[PDB]
Design a protein around this ligand. Structure first.
Ligand SMILES: *C(=O)CCCCCCCCC
Length: 13
């Protein structure tokens, strides 16, 4: 869990 969103570059998935 974490895989689907570090706080900035991308978003969810
Ligand atoms: C949450 O997304 C944790 C990531 C799961 C790690 C599973 C190991 C993968 C390499 C064997």
């Amino acid at each position: 869990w974490x895989d689907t969103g570090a706080d900035x570059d991308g978003x969810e998935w």
